[PDB]
Amino acid sequence: MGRARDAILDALENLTAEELKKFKLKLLSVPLREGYGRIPRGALLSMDALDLTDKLVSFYLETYGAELTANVLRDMGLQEMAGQLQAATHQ
Amino acid sequence: MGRARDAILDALENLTAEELKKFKLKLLSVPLREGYGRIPRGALLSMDALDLTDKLVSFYLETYGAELTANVLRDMGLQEMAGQLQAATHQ
Amino acid sequence: MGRARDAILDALENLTAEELKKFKLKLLSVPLREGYGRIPRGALLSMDALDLTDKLVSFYLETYGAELTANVLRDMGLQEMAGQLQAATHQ
Amino acid sequence: MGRARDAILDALENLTAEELKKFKLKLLSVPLREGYGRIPRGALLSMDALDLTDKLVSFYLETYGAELTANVLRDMGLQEMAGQLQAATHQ
Amino acid sequence: MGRARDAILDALENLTAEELKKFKLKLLSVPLREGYGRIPRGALLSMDALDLTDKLVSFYLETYGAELTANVLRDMGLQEMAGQLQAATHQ
Amino acid sequence: MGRARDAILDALENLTAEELKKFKLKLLSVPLREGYGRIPRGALLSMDALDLTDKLVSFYLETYGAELTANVLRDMGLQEMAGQLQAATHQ
Amino acid sequence: MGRARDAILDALENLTAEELKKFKLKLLSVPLREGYGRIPRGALLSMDALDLTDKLVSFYLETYGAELTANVLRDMGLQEMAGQLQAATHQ
Amino acid sequence: MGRARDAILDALENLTAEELKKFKLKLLSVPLREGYGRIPRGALLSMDALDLTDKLVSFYLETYGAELTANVLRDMGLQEMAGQLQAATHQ
Amino acid sequence: MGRARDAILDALENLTAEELKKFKLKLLSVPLREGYGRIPRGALLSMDALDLTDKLVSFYLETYGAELTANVLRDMGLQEMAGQLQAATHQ
Amino acid sequence: MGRARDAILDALENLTAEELKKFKLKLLSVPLREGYGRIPRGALLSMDALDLTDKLVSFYLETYGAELTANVLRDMGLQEMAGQLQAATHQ
Amino acid sequence: MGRARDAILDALENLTAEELKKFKLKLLSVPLREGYGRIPRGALLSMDALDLTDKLVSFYLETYGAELTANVLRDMGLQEMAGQLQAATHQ
Amino acid sequence: MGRARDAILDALENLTAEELKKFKLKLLSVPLREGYGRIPRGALLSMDALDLTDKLVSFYLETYGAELTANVLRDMGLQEMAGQLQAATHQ
Amino acid sequence: MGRARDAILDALENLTAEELKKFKLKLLSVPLREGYGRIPRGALLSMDALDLTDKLVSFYLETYGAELTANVLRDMGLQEMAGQLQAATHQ
Amino acid sequence: MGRARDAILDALENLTAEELKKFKLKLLSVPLREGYGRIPRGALLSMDALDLTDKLVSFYLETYGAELTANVLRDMGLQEMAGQLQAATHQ
């Protein structure tokens, strides 16, 4: 088990209830590269942090997941945990 | 065999719980073309999206089932799902 | 997918509690184009801004949804942040 | 089978949570004509409006249930929804 | 749907706190014609102007609502917005 | 079955929050006649008006409940609503 | 319901602050008929004129309430205003 | 088969899970006359109302079951619906 | 259960709101006998008069609560309120 | 079997959640005598009054459970409920 | 964001508590450009200078708001502070 | 088990929602020695005092929780309640 | 707990709104002993005498707080109230 | 985490309610360099000082947040506590 599955989940556990749903809604419209699908919306409106992390690390690998979450956090206004996430992923 | 069984799938996979029950409840009252039966009341209120797609593609053919769900989608006001679904259907 | 969902949300994120209440109340009587239903009252009076975005998108696409929100905002007095909304939607 | 499945859904979906419970509790004492029984209390006290439509159409025929709901609404003070639904049902 | 809902809410938006509660209290004793109930008191003393518009149009018909509000406003002394209200509603 | 179900109904929604809590607190101390126990306190501090009616009618007779509510009602000061409750229940 | 609720409030708006609280304080010591309670002090020490009228209606009906306010207003010196008050109430 | 199997069961469907839970909990402590055992603890705490009635009528005959249910409902606070139960049982 | 719950009650709504904070501030400091604890301070800063009565009856029985209320009420110099309260309580 | 099973029963529905939660929290810290374990940490924080009653009676003796509940109730300040329950248990 | 929202702010806190009232009422009669609504009275007659600036910038354009404020302040007679604020605005 | 479970919890419900907010706010900022992790804020900003004590004892033993609470409470100025806190701790 | 809570209370009873303002403002500059913080400005500038006593005893020892109060009243030249307060506090 | 979490908090409770609102108002227009977004306005104008600092850290990092707060506090006029906070920041 790569440590990346952990260094990402700790990021979501400091996000409040009012903002995590904003995050997950924003996830529906984030840009995607070629060869990668999107999580279905019907299941989308159901996860908490841990199982959402599970499906992100499943459909997306550790790397592209890391950068996509970093970018989307930077988009929504928070770059602070984005910075430490960047540091943890890059090293 | 037309891949529409997957189109109806991700069409149903992108929609949540409070509206899928509305979907099936409306399916009990939508008009049906001749030569076609209606799904029995006994079990219908229990199966998931997967089994729903399975039965609709079994009893009804791909075009008829797809257009039926499509009309139901415009019935609830959901056209964006219906639009991409019809896009997948006609071509 | 279209970045309109990404754009529109910012408008509702910059309104007070009573402002969005007036918004949703006026939404019940706005004119509608042919073939478009209206969101039911019992639901709309409970969800927040982002959920309201989700349902308006599910009912109205990027173009019609954007224009109708712009019309409502121009009706209620905000022509300015609606101005950047319509500017972003156009390009 | 009667189309009344939709209008009754249309009525229940635009009414708030505080008044749907008023509806269901008032259903316990509305007069009932011959040949019909009254819905058990315990089951209804947790189930939603659409399933309520389901059982009321099951035990009571669509027309009778329609005027029953209309009588409850004019009893509880809602007139315009009652009028629109009775217009849909009568013709 | 009828534009009269807006013609009521916009009129009530220029009423001050002592004005609106005096309006609401006199509403408890205004004469009512046959076939129409009265708003319950306990909840009435809590919700705001827009909520009040919703309830009055729910209990009373948008036309009938227009005349009853016009009557009560003329009764309480303010004749200006009564005039603009009747002008807007009549056509 | 007796209309005491909705006869008492309008009684609670014509009195607002600060006195309905007084109502239930009085209920903890009003004397009870033989063969009937007192409602558990933990549930009373959480039920609303409708749940209050449901519990009191379930545990106390529609008649006996009518006299109980009337007595506690004019005991706390309100005789008028107790007035039409007297009128409706006893006739 | 009786017009008295309107016929009473008309007394309180033509009189300014120092005498309304004098009426207020005299209310604590006025004689009461049997079977009638008195407004709680700390509760009464907060409302305005219209809420005071509502409280008077809550404990006292149109007849006894109007009579007692008329008697007190006569007692406190202002004789004419009680004049048109009793004129409106008697017929 | 006696119709008492149906008679008793009508009591269960108007009792939701909470009072159902206290009912089944008290069942482990209700008084027992000679010649009668008690329902096993393991099967009790998970089983639905219909099967509760089934083992009620198997372990205990129609009469003993009738009075034990009447007594336990009276103990838990419901004597009205228990009242019609006992009225049906005696005649 | 003693009517002191009703008795103590009417004392708190006959005292001004500016006083009740001084009331509770003294209550969190008055001497107590053995075997009885003191109210959690943070909660009493948010309870109302009714909730204050509820808590004092919950921790202290009707009697001891009566003497403590009398002692604190005479301590602040309020002679009339203390006299009427003790007259109600002692007999 | 011992009727304290019922007594401790209504020792809990007379109190609501926010004191129930601190009660069950202190149950993790109440003194334990020899031969008795403690309720497991994982499950304890999840069930309602009835279920925790079941577990405490299974783990602990009716006399032992009753006395420990009395002690912890005295610890949290509720004295009169403790007194009546201990009166029931002793005789 | 334009400094015009700020540029009005400092120009307003040197306006005494009485003349902001006449300023507010005068705002209800100022000429308005087409496509622009008028600020609601019920709100406007209650906020301070800060919130008045907030809603005037929201409803009216920052350039438009600045010029209209300069015009109206010139209308009442003040030329010095009006001159400095307009000088700050245009350049 | 150490009695600090109570000795901490009692320090919290005797202070209102305002100060516990800055308490929990500083908790994610106070220094930690090595080997001890920090409670996530995402769950933190929605818990009560009880759950706060629970997680503090979970992550940190009774002693370390005791001194951290004492020191942070000193930081926010409360020296006396914290005073009996250490008085309980060392002895 | 110390009676110093009560005395300081009526140490403030004869202070006018103007002198208590001078009191609190000079409390912002009085020297303090080590181990004690300074009162937050925004909070003090809105609290009353009672809340001021609450905060000062919360942060400063009853002995320490009483000595500081004696000192500050001595600073302003207030001799009589300071003398009686210090006489009460010392013994 | 950097201590600046409280080094900003202490700068907020020492200023009154009348000026924190115009502080957050000015925050709506502060200059921002690239990579830094602006807090949504609607949610902004409802938070307190603590939540204000929370999103100050959430949107902007420690040094950036501290310097922007220093600049804005210099801009609004207060020079003393601004110097205090900046002195706390740099060293």
Side-chain angles (χ1 to χ4, degrees):
Chain A
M1 51 192 205
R3 53 92 172 174
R5 76 169 202 190
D6 291 331
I8 62 170
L9 60 88
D10 63 358
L12 277 296
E13 300 166 311
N14 287 294
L15 274 293
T16 75
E18 61 86 20
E19 59 208 28
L20 54 85
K21 74 182 81 43
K22 182 174 73 68
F23 181 76
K24 64 173 291 173
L25 180 59
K26 180 67 174 66
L27 294 174
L28 188 142
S29 179
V30 298
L32 303 175
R33 298 180 295 81
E34 69 275 16
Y36 293 99
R38 191 177 294 274
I39 192 67
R41 195 267 298 166
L44 188 153
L45 296 174
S46 60
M47 291 56 68
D48 63 358
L50 61 83
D51 62 357
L52 183 63
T53 300
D54 173 1
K55 295 183 289 294
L56 276 296
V57 65
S58 66
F59 291 166
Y60 308 100
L61 74 164
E62 77 301 337
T63 301
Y64 193 40
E67 292 84 4
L68 67 88
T69 81
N71 299 315
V72 65
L73 276 296
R74 183 178 62 252
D75 291 331
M76 61 79 71
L78 190 149
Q79 53 274 60
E80 289 71 354
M81 281 166 107
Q84 56 83 31
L85 183 63
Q86 183 283 349
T89 61
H90 294 88
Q91 183 66 41
Chain B
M1 183 278 288
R3 274 321 171 171
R5 65 150 161 151
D6 291 331
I8 62 170
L9 178 60
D10 44 358
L12 270 296
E13 294 294 328
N14 293 315
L15 57 87
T16 178
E18 69 275 16
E19 67 208 8
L20 59 83
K21 65 178 72 66
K22 186 180 188 294
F23 203 60
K24 54 192 81 63
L25 266 70
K26 294 197 294 176
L27 294 174
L28 277 296
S29 44
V30 298
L32 324 172
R33 188 172 61 239
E34 69 275 16
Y36 293 99
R38 201 180 275 289
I39 302 302
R41 78 287 184 274
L44 187 153
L45 283 72
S46 81
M47 283 73 74
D48 66 349
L50 306 170
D51 291 331
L52 183 63
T53 64
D54 291 331
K55 314 163 211 93
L56 63 89
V57 65
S58 52
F59 291 166
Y60 315 85
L61 61 92
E62 69 298 337
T63 296
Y64 188 37
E67 65 183 1
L68 285 182
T69 81
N71 301 128
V72 176
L73 294 154
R74 280 82 65 192
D75 186 74
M76 65 184 73
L78 185 38
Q79 286 71 237
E80 295 74 359
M81 291 275 248
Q84 54 83 29
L85 183 63
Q86 188 274 331
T89 61
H90 66 279
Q91 60 84 29
Chain C
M1 183 278 288
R3 44 87 176 171
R5 271 179 160 293
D6 291 331
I8 62 170
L9 61 83
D10 63 358
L12 294 174
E13 293 178 353
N14 286 49
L15 317 172
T16 73
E18 69 275 16
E19 293 179 353
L20 58 90
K21 291 177 70 68
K22 185 178 68 32
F23 177 76
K24 45 194 301 163
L25 181 62
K26 187 183 287 185
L27 189 151
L28 185 62
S29 169
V30 296
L32 299 178
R33 196 180 298 119
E34 293 83 3
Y36 297 100
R38 191 175 293 275
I39 192 67
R41 310 179 51 264
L44 64 86
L45 55 86
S46 80
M47 283 74 74
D48 66 358
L50 58 94
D51 291 331
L52 183 63
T53 62
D54 183 9
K55 276 74 70 177
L56 61 93
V57 176
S58 67
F59 275 13
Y60 294 98
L61 74 164
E62 69 275 16
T63 299
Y64 194 20
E67 62 205 70
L68 61 87
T69 81
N71 294 123
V72 176
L73 271 296
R74 185 202 52 268
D75 189 358
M76 61 79 71
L78 173 56
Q79 289 71 241
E80 285 71 1
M81 182 163 178
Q84 55 84 31
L85 294 174
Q86 63 84 30
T89 61
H90 293 172
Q91 183 66 41
Chain D
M1 182 305 278
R3 182 230 54 71
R5 272 298 165 149
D6 291 331
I8 62 171
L9 183 63
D10 291 331
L12 277 296
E13 65 183 1
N14 292 62
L15 58 92
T16 188
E18 294 294 328
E19 65 183 1
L20 61 83
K21 59 178 69 66
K22 200 164 170 313
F23 203 70
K24 65 191 290 183
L25 63 89
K26 292 186 70 174
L27 293 175
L28 277 296
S29 296
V30 298
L32 179 60
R33 65 181 173 87
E34 293 82 3
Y36 293 98
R38 190 169 293 276
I39 311 304
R41 185 177 65 247
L44 58 86
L45 294 174
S46 66
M47 60 79 71
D48 65 358
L50 56 87
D51 291 331
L52 183 63
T53 61
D54 291 331
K55 276 74 70 177
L56 64 93
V57 176
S58 69
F59 273 140
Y60 317 138
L61 61 84
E62 72 298 339
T63 299
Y64 186 39
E67 59 254 11
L68 289 171
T69 69
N71 284 115
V72 176
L73 314 185
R74 294 162 281 81
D75 189 358
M76 61 79 71
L78 174 55
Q79 287 69 240
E80 293 82 3
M81 281 196 107
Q84 63 84 30
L85 62 93
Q86 63 84 30
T89 61
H90 294 89
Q91 199 44 56
Chain E
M1 172 285 258
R3 52 88 175 172
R5 183 184 294 271
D6 291 331
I8 297 169
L9 61 83
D10 63 358
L12 294 174
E13 291 179 353
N14 291 320
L15 277 296
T16 75
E18 69 275 16
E19 293 179 353
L20 59 86
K21 54 182 91 73
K22 185 173 72 68
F23 173 80
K24 182 174 71 68
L25 181 65
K26 193 152 102 191
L27 188 153
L28 190 153
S29 175
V30 295
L32 296 175
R33 79 157 68 102
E34 69 275 16
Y36 293 98
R38 191 173 293 274
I39 190 67
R41 309 180 52 250
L44 183 63
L45 282 72
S46 80
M47 283 73 74
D48 63 358
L50 59 88
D51 291 331
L52 183 63
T53 61
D54 186 74
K55 334 202 190 63
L56 62 93
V57 66
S58 67
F59 293 98
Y60 301 98
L61 190 150
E62 71 296 340
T63 296
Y64 184 32
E67 292 84 4
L68 60 88
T69 73
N71 296 125
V72 65
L73 270 297
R74 193 183 49 266
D75 291 331
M76 61 79 71
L78 188 153
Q79 67 281 310
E80 308 91 337
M81 281 176 108
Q84 60 82 30
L85 182 63
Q86 63 84 30
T89 61
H90 294 172
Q91 183 66 41
Chain F
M1 175 304 288
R3 294 71 60 211
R5 274 282 171 206
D6 43 358
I8 62 170
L9 188 153
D10 63 358
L12 294 174
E13 293 83 3
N14 290 314
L15 57 92
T16 180
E18 69 275 16
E19 69 275 16
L20 59 84
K21 49 178 65 64
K22 167 155 159 45
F23 197 76
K24 54 182 81 43
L25 298 189
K26 295 299 292 296
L27 263 51
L28 277 296
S29 63
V30 298
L32 323 177
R33 65 182 180 179
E34 293 82 3
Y36 320 124
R38 189 172 293 277
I39 320 309
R41 188 269 298 164
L44 294 174
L45 277 296
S46 61
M47 295 298 102
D48 66 274
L50 319 175
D51 291 331
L52 183 63
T53 81
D54 291 331
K55 299 298 293 295
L56 63 93
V57 176
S58 69
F59 292 166
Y60 307 140
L61 195 67
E62 71 295 338
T63 295
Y64 186 38
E67 292 84 4
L68 283 183
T69 66
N71 295 125
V72 65
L73 190 46
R74 82 292 183 276
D75 186 74
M76 61 79 71
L78 172 56
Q79 286 71 241
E80 296 72 356
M81 293 178 70
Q84 70 274 16
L85 270 294
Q86 182 62 255
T89 61
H90 294 88
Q91 204 44 56
Chain G
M1 183 278 288
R3 80 196 162 280
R5 258 196 167 287
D6 186 74
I8 62 170
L9 55 90
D10 63 358
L12 294 174
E13 76 283 14
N14 300 115
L15 65 91
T16 183
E18 69 275 16
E19 69 275 16
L20 61 87
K21 64 192 71 93
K22 185 171 73 69
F23 214 80
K24 184 163 191 303
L25 59 86
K26 290 176 70 175
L27 188 153
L28 182 60
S29 179
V30 293
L32 321 180
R33 193 178 299 119
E34 293 82 3
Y36 293 99
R38 191 178 294 276
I39 305 281
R41 295 180 66 253
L44 67 87
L45 311 180
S46 85
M47 311 76 78
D48 63 358
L50 58 87
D51 291 331
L52 183 63
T53 61
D54 183 18
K55 298 293 183 182
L56 265 295
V57 177
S58 67
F59 291 173
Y60 294 97
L61 74 164
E62 74 299 339
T63 294
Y64 190 27
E67 294 294 328
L68 60 88
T69 81
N71 300 130
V72 176
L73 183 60
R74 185 177 65 247
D75 291 331
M76 61 79 71
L78 185 62
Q79 59 278 310
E80 315 91 336
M81 192 155 208
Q84 70 275 16
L85 264 291
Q86 63 84 30
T89 60
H90 294 172
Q91 183 66 41
Chain H
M1 81 185 188
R3 284 321 161 181
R5 74 141 181 170
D6 291 331
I8 62 170
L9 66 83
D10 64 358
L12 277 297
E13 303 88 5
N14 298 266
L15 269 63
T16 187
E18 293 82 3
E19 66 275 20
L20 190 69
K21 276 198 46 152
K22 68 186 44 54
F23 173 100
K24 61 186 317 165
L25 193 67
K26 177 46 192 162
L27 287 177
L28 271 185
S29 54
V30 298
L32 278 186
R33 79 159 68 104
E34 69 275 16
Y36 293 98
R38 190 171 296 277
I39 188 69
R41 75 286 184 273
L44 194 55
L45 311 189
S46 85
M47 182 179 72
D48 63 358
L50 302 158
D51 291 331
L52 294 174
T53 62
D54 291 331
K55 276 73 69 177
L56 275 174
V57 65
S58 51
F59 273 141
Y60 313 99
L61 73 164
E62 69 275 16
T63 62
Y64 195 28
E67 69 256 11
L68 66 86
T69 71
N71 295 125
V72 65
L73 276 296
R74 189 179 67 249
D75 291 331
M76 61 79 71
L78 171 46
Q79 64 276 59
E80 288 72 354
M81 182 146 173
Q84 56 82 28
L85 294 174
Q86 63 84 30
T89 61
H90 295 285
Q91 196 43 56
Chain I
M1 183 278 288
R3 305 147 310 298
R5 271 211 159 280
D6 291 331
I8 301 299
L9 183 63
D10 64 358
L12 283 72
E13 293 83 3
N14 297 25
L15 60 84
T16 175
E18 61 76 13
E19 190 277 331
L20 59 84
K21 54 192 80 43
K22 176 262 292 178
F23 190 72
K24 65 178 72 66
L25 288 178
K26 292 203 294 172
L27 270 67
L28 62 94
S29 44
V30 298
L32 304 175
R33 305 162 291 81
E34 61 86 20
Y36 292 165
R38 193 173 290 273
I39 301 299
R41 188 269 299 164
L44 61 83
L45 277 296
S46 82
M47 295 298 102
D48 70 356
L50 285 73
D51 291 331
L52 183 63
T53 61
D54 291 331
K55 298 293 183 182
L56 63 89
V57 181
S58 75
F59 293 98
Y60 292 162
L61 73 163
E62 72 297 330
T63 295
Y64 189 37
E67 292 84 4
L68 302 181
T69 59
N71 293 123
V72 61
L73 188 56
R74 65 179 177 88
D75 186 74
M76 64 184 73
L78 273 296
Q79 69 275 17
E80 312 88 330
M81 182 76 97
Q84 54 83 31
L85 161 74
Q86 63 84 30
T89 61
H90 295 285
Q91 200 44 55
Chain J
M1 162 295 298
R3 284 291 150 141
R5 178 65 176 170
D6 291 331
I8 62 170
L9 183 63
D10 53 333
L12 276 297
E13 296 87 6
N14 55 7
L15 57 92
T16 183
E18 71 285 0
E19 66 275 22
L20 181 68
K21 49 176 62 65
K22 44 186 301 302
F23 179 103
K24 62 189 289 182
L25 192 69
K26 295 185 292 296
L27 293 175
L28 269 182
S29 47
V30 298
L32 285 174
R33 82 156 69 108
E34 69 275 16
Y36 293 98
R38 191 168 295 278
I39 294 90
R41 76 286 184 273
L44 166 82
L45 311 182
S46 82
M47 73 291 291
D48 62 271
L50 310 159
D51 291 331
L52 61 83
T53 313
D54 179 319
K55 268 83 73 175
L56 67 90
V57 172
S58 49
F59 279 172
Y60 304 146
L61 273 297
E62 293 82 3
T63 61
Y64 180 63
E67 61 86 20
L68 64 88
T69 55
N71 294 122
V72 65
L73 195 63
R74 286 206 288 93
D75 291 331
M76 61 79 71
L78 183 62
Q79 295 297 109
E80 317 87 15
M81 295 298 102
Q84 52 81 26
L85 62 83
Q86 63 84 30
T89 61
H90 294 88
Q91 193 42 56
Chain K
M1 183 177 177
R3 314 321 280 201
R5 157 163 292 280
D6 291 331
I8 62 170
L9 291 173
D10 60 357
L12 189 53
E13 298 88 5
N14 297 61
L15 280 298
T16 181
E18 57 85 21
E19 65 183 1
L20 56 89
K21 178 242 191 182
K22 62 89 177 177
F23 195 74
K24 266 164 47 161
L25 63 87
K26 187 53 216 73
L27 294 174
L28 266 296
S29 65
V30 297
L32 279 176
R33 192 182 299 121
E34 69 275 16
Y36 293 99
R38 189 166 292 278
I39 321 303
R41 303 181 54 253
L44 185 145
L45 272 69
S46 81
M47 283 74 74
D48 62 355
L50 285 70
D51 291 331
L52 183 63
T53 50
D54 306 335
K55 276 74 70 177
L56 70 88
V57 176
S58 69
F59 292 166
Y60 299 160
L61 188 63
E62 69 275 16
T63 63
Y64 187 34
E67 51 205 290
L68 65 87
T69 55
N71 284 114
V72 65
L73 186 57
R74 260 185 280 98
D75 291 331
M76 61 79 71
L78 179 61
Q79 72 278 17
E80 302 93 329
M81 191 165 208
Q84 63 84 30
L85 62 92
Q86 62 85 31
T89 54
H90 63 86
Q91 197 43 56
Chain L
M1 182 179 72
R3 284 291 150 171
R5 291 289 294 157
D6 291 331
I8 62 170
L9 65 87
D10 63 358
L12 276 296
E13 293 83 3
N14 54 16
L15 60 84
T16 197
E18 190 276 331
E19 54 272 19
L20 55 88
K21 212 194 153 204
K22 66 177 71 66
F23 185 83
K24 63 193 322 167
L25 192 152
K26 295 183 290 294
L27 288 179
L28 62 93
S29 66
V30 296
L32 277 180
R33 74 209 64 157
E34 69 275 16
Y36 292 165
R38 190 172 294 276
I39 183 67
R41 55 172 301 296
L44 178 142
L45 278 76
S46 83
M47 295 298 102
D48 66 353
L50 284 73
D51 291 331
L52 183 63
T53 52
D54 183 75
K55 54 192 81 83
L56 286 172
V57 175
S58 75
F59 293 99
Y60 321 102
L61 74 164
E62 69 275 16
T63 65
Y64 183 73
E67 73 256 9
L68 70 86
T69 63
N71 302 330
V72 65
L73 198 61
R74 297 202 269 91
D75 291 331
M76 61 79 71
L78 182 62
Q79 305 323 115
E80 286 70 0
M81 293 177 70
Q84 70 274 16
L85 264 293
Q86 71 274 16
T89 62
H90 44 266
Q91 191 40 56
Chain M
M1 183 278 288
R3 312 328 309 201
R5 297 293 296 163
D6 291 331
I8 62 171
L9 294 174
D10 42 358
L12 276 297
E13 189 273 332
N14 299 116
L15 272 75
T16 61
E18 61 86 20
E19 55 207 71
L20 59 86
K21 179 231 181 183
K22 180 266 290 180
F23 190 79
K24 47 188 312 172
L25 63 87
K26 68 167 62 176
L27 268 68
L28 277 296
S29 46
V30 290
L32 294 174
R33 187 174 61 241
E34 69 275 16
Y36 306 103
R38 293 226 87 166
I39 301 299
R41 295 179 67 250
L44 62 87
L45 294 174
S46 65
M47 295 299 102
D48 63 359
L50 303 93
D51 291 331
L52 183 63
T53 61
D54 291 331
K55 298 293 183 182
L56 68 89
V57 183
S58 314
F59 294 152
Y60 310 81
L61 187 70
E62 71 295 338
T63 299
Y64 188 40
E67 293 179 353
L68 304 180
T69 58
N71 295 337
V72 58
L73 278 71
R74 268 197 332 280
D75 291 331
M76 64 184 73
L78 179 58
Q79 70 275 17
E80 306 90 340
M81 191 85 108
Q84 55 83 30
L85 183 63
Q86 63 84 30
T89 61
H90 294 89
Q91 203 45 56
Chain N
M1 182 179 72
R3 64 221 71 191
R5 168 67 72 189
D6 63 358
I8 62 170
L9 187 153
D10 63 358
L12 274 298
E13 82 285 17
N14 54 9
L15 61 87
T16 185
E18 190 276 331
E19 66 208 19
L20 55 88
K21 58 176 67 65
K22 64 91 175 179
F23 179 88
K24 62 190 318 167
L25 180 44
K26 185 53 212 73
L27 294 174
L28 183 62
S29 44
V30 297
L32 282 176
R33 65 180 182 269
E34 190 276 331
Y36 293 98
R38 188 169 295 277
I39 303 97
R41 194 267 297 166
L44 189 145
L45 272 69
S46 313
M47 295 298 102
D48 62 353
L50 283 71
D51 291 331
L52 183 63
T53 49
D54 296 329
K55 276 74 70 177
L56 294 174
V57 176
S58 302
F59 286 91
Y60 319 106
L61 61 83
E62 293 82 3
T63 62
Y64 186 69
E67 61 86 20
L68 65 86
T69 56
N71 291 120
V72 65
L73 191 60
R74 280 205 327 265
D75 291 331
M76 61 79 71
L78 188 153
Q79 71 277 18
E80 294 87 359
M81 183 278 288
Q84 188 274 331
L85 61 85
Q86 60 85 31
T89 61
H90 63 86
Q91 198 43 56

